[PDB]
Symmetry: D2
Subunit: 297 residues, 4 copies
Amino acid sequence: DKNIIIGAMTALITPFKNGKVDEQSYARLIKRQIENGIDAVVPVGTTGESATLTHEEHRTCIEIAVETCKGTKVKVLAGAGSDATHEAVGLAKFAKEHGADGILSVAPYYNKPTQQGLYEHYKAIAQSVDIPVLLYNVPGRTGCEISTDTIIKLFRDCENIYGVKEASGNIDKCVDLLAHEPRMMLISGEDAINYPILSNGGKGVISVTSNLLPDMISALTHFALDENYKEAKKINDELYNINKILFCESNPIPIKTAMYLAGLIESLEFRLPLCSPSKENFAKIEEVMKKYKIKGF
Amino acid sequence: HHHHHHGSMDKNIIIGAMTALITPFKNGKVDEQSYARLIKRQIENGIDAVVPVGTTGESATLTHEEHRTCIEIAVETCKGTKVKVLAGAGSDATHEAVGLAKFAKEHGADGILSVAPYYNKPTQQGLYEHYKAIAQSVDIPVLLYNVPGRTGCEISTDTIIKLFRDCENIYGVKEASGNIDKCVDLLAHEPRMMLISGEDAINYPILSNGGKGVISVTSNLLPDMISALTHFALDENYKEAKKINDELYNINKILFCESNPIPIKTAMYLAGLIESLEFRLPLCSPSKENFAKIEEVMKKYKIKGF
Amino acid sequence: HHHHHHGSMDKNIIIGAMTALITPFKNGKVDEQSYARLIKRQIENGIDAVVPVGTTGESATLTHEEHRTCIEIAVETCKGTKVKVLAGAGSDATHEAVGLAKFAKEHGADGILSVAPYYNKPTQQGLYEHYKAIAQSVDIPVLLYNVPGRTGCEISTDTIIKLFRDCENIYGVKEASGNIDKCVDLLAHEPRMMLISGEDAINYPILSNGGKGVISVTSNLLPDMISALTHFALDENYKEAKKINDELYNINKILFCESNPIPIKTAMYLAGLIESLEFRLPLCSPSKENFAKIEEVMKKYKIKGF
Amino acid sequence: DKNIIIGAMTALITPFKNGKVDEQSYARLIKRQIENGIDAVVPVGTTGESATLTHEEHRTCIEIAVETCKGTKVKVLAGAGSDATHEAVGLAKFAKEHGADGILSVAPYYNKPTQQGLYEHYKAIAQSVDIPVLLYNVPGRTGCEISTDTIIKLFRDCENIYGVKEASGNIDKCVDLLAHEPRMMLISGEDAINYPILSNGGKGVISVTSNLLPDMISALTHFALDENYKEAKKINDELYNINKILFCESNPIPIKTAMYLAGLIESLEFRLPLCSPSKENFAKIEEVMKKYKIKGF
Ligand SMILES: N[C@@H](CCCC[NH3+])C(=O)O
Ligand SMILES: N[C@@H](CCCC[NH3+])C(=O)O
Ligand SMILES: N[C@@H](CCCC[NH3+])C(=O)O
Ligand SMILES: N[C@@H](CCCC[NH3+])C(=O)O
Ligand SMILES: [Mg+2]
Ligand SMILES: [Mg+2]
Ligand SMILES: [Mg+2]
Ligand SMILES: [Mg+2]
Ligand SMILES: [Mg+2]
Ligand SMILES: [Mg+2]
Ligand SMILES: [Mg+2]
Ligand SMILES: [Mg+2]
Ligand code: NA
Ligand code: NA
């Protein structure tokens, strides 16, 4: 009864070259996702360094994702979150006007809105567009938590709001959400627990690991959606070691390191305050990667 | 000699739907008649094992004599049925935990549950030595139990796995930790162990990841539902197991609106399954507001009698 | 060349009683007239410095243009008085934080406050490089600001001390971390730095351990009391400083019953110091119950007007 | 208006010899506390391994402390806490009948009583004796927190209850307590922050560090009680490094290690589940100790 964006999705890294977005590398990486079974891509979330891109660069990345996915089955769920509602509304409207299929919108970071404030924030965002809106709860980064009651209120009050990406390590809340509002789309935002969230009726993932292993994350998700829980769990178990090492330092530091280690990006460049991992973690990531089958271009 | 290759050797296991039994009091004493009646009710409603005197059974405030009496009643009531007794045997002192383990073995328990030491916060090395001493003292199965919110310590995944591999009788862990990532970690690195849900609201997610049973609070009140849930999941009927887990969320949540076992004893009293709402200090009755919340949540569930 | 021995070299410091200024809105826009009037009221009530556009001033929802306008109003209103402007200049993007730092320098601020990056959780190495870039971009004092409950990250004691020793202009930290152990750690290992209280309820404990000022929310409402408290403590009149800190506990606590600045703007509205109770989303009015709690707590304090 | 036990106090380690309490070593260690300015000793708290002593051994330790302090100015604040009220009442009555000056009583661990339960627990304990009772809040070990409201209610409702030993890293609560009930005795239970608690009007410490450095902890406390905050802070600052290293593993593992390293106990023996520190932390403790002046016997 709602328009939705579900399935296996990738929180795209943003490659830099000489401090600027490498727009050619960005398109090439998206094509690699498309060719490895991914159902949607998410430009410029946390993994794509939304904090340090300018609003102009953020918009360019959304445009490249839309352009690269045009004529393919793959949807663009554009990163559009902000701690300021007026900025989040501006990004939402841009995404809509520029052909995104939907938006992801992180809970406001830093300023710690109340539940009433979160409700008004997301209602303003939903009112600004006519495309699907996925909430995104990540309290370890934002300092706030969108409660189950608030999520369900938004889902019932706002046609566009169709679910939530949960990055909260809280499978109890995942049960609470789908037991009380089974129509919503619960999306895993934590790779290590993709299979538990899917096996409780979640309908997709927004993945960091899929930057490196898109075929494995897509296979996992599609097995679970087909109720082949044995085969989905097998992949989730196999992926635990890489899923864990990709957070040995704050995301996206390990995943960009891994993409560089596999020759998939040309330089290991971040924007401050992000920076290279320690040499010890660089080497740890490399050793974990050697246990997995990494697709090229 | 000791060795590191026990993981695929015969570990007698105790799995399935299990109940963390409340301990009813009458005039301050254990009501042994009521205790037996309650265990019989679990047996008649599909439960696979009972756990006398865990946290839910007020292990902290029973004397060592009363703790042993409850184990004996559980063994006697389950004798001749298929239902096993996984006796609560944990302590923050290794010498007390070894004493309880030996008692359980000598008095016919099928296995023991053994909570991580509370209060004194041992290191991982100390936890390893604690559980090695317990496992070496008996020849019956030992289930570890991690509940960091109550103990102040955590048995790490690496320590759990070492104990499983290093000790013949340690066969798994009951997790009450709100940490489905750790549940994945445990079974991805040591799939031979028995992961047991210790948090009712997430029984189905743990079982669907390959956990093999539950040690339940809710089953004191709704044994039939918890056993049906567990057995559906063990049969890989995940649709039907999830349906019950979802239906149970409201009661599963309200049973922790105050520290367990305050809500479950309140519910058992409200349903007419125990005669008085009695605890031993420092536990006590819930607030009037929470008493009323529990009563309202219960109206949506069909409560079996005796 | 860079070096590691800045600790005893001239660090121009900004210390004393300071106010994290609220930013009043009128019809959604910054009310620049009200802002100036409020700053003048701080000046006339003993405050040593003002902090435009920190967390309390809704830095997240001001545009970069409005943020700069508020810095300019603060500088102009304090010109010719002894009161200094420690401009809010923090960001989760180093390039934005450097831009704000340079603006503050070029537009006459006396120094900058710079919050640890929120949301993107940089490593300690990244925080070091962040603040090195900021400090190297200007020649005015830089105060670090740690508030892990809002940012999701913590500037460790070792990183703070390295920055103090390695950068000429970094002179201390504003701690809003509920961690008096860290306050001891900081000043026991680097007593030359300026530790500034960022949590009003514990202003006196931080000052009595050798902290040298406060960056206050409560002083928006009670500037006289917060400045008197701070100045008593700096004079080693701990008895009189503690007396005020104790008297202020109730208002200090209620001003965080919802996320700052929701309660302080509510109180400023209730006292008649701002004309409308307006925030920018995602901030909004308090619940009716908390509005009423704030109003009741305020009745015990004598509120200065203009 | 209340009888109180305040000043510099030591949470006594319990030495073992061949697995039994070394009663001669215990007395010798208490005499060393007496001769180095300490105002009271606390037998068998957390630091004295209350969890693994038997009830008989616990009682023996209280008796040795009372006997050794008789005829000196030093008081015995006997450890008497339990997670079972009936056990805590039994210990309280024993201490009273055996000549202790007061009791310390830890908040119930493991079973997580509600505030009403904590109130009834401590009221039962206070009703059982006619000597002073000090509450003890240590949420990191017990899993519960005695709220300020509950502490103040107990102080006002129970003559014997005269204050609280706080081990909660919460100087805000320390302000809350003494601003609303300035008659109580707030006692520092965390060595690193002894000086902040004293300078806000706390009136003593129950120390781990004083096992090793009793003269320094007593000097610190007495300077603060005399309003010589400069000299108290100086000692608190000097002690930070040892105060921190004594919790590099769970107390009392480091402090027993330090006492062994200084030749003050003959064997580094614990009762399971406590055990020796790692060899790396053993060496770290030794290196920190070399910066301090350690009194002998
Ligand atoms: N650094 C600011 C602006 C980023 C704008 C592009 N996403 C923030 O993190 O909100
Ligand atoms: N109250 C003590 C003894 C309990 C003995 C019977 N389980 C404890 O919690 O360890
Ligand atoms: N909302 C963005 C931009 C604020 C710009 C003015 N301080 C942030 O919080 O970083
Ligand atoms: N091990 C039990 C009994 C200790 C009895 C002597 N303090 C407990 O920690 O409560
Ligand atoms: Mg977003
Ligand atoms: Mg093995
Ligand atoms: Mg147990
Ligand atoms: Mg592991
Ligand atoms: Mg230096
Ligand atoms: Mg700032
Ligand atoms: Mg340090
Ligand atoms: Mg005690
Ligand atoms: Na609509
Ligand atoms: Na009395």
